[PDB]
UniProtKB/TrEMBL annotation:
GO terms for molecular function: rRNA binding; structural constituent of ribosome. SUPFAM superfamilies: dsRNA-binding domain-like, Ribosomal protein S5 domain 2-like. Residues 2-65 form the S5 DRBM domain. The N-terminal domain interacts with the head of the 30S subunit; the C-terminal domain interacts with the body and contacts protein S4. The interaction surface between S4 and S5 is involved in control of translational fidelity. It comes from the Bacteria. It comes from Staphylococcus aureus. GO terms for biological process: ribosome biogenesis; translation. This is Small ribosomal subunit protein uS5. Keywords: Ribonucleoprotein, Ribosomal protein, RNA-binding, rRNA-binding. The keyword Ribosomal protein applies. With S4 and S12 plays an important role in translational accuracy. Located at the back of the 30S subunit body where it stabilizes the conformation of the head with respect to the body. The gene is rpsE. Belongs to the universal ribosomal protein uS5 family.
Length: 154
RNA sequence: UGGAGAGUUUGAUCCUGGCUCAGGAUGAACGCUGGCGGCGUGCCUAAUACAUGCAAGUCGAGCGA
């Protein structure tokens, strides 16, 4: 079993052309607090029924994040399109600071670090796709120790 | 050692982009209420004429009288 949160919903369609559409949508992040997250988007006109379509879209996506049990291994500027968050490791004891779309993703991988703010992000969709693009590009020491010498560098 | 955001142009979007709020401050004023032990700081606006008080004397083993 997993955990989900409703980040945002909308009421997006064209009102009357002779026949009405007025649909909703959602952007649900799912996670397990072990290091695997995801996100997906569905749409329907009955209000909480598009969430079950949205959690359906995110269970088929898992992203493995390295961890030193509380923070991230290094720093990176997770960038996608027009969004850019900044993330950097803390010391164990300080909690995850906000960025609300970026706040709820970092708690469902299971860390307690600082989070620098969204630099150029505007809307809560590209905050999410810039968050996940940051998390899926970190590096361990062991995989680096594969294609180098064997843990010399300290 | 340590670094958050939200709102608003469209029938509905993504972007550029402004304006606006939450917070910390004051040798502040002013608004309501009033128990203090104790610690500090109280002409920042007309350089607008300054009553009354005290702030530079001491030495009688200088020397006169």
């Amino acid at each position: 079993e997993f955990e989900e949160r409703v980040v945002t919903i909308n009421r997006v369609a064209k009102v009357v052309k002779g026949g009405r559409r007025f649909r909703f949508t959602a952007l649900v992040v799912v996670g397990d607090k072990n290091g695997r997250v995801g996100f997906g988007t569905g749409k329907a006109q009955e209000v909480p029924e598009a969430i079950k379509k949205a959690v359906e879209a995110a269970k088929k996506d898992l992203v493995v994040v390295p961890r030193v049990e509380g923070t991230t291994p290094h720093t990176i500027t997770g960038r996608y399109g027009s969004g850019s968050v900044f993330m950097k490791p803390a010391a164990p004891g300080t909690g995850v600071i906000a960025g609300g779309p970026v706040r709820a993703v970092l708690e469902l991988a299971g860390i307690t670090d600082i989070l620098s703010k969204s630099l150029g992000s505007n809307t809560p969709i590209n905050m999410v796709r810039a968050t996940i693009d940051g998390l899926q590009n970190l590096k361990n020491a062991e995989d680096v120790a594969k294609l180098r010498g064997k843990t010399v560098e300290e």
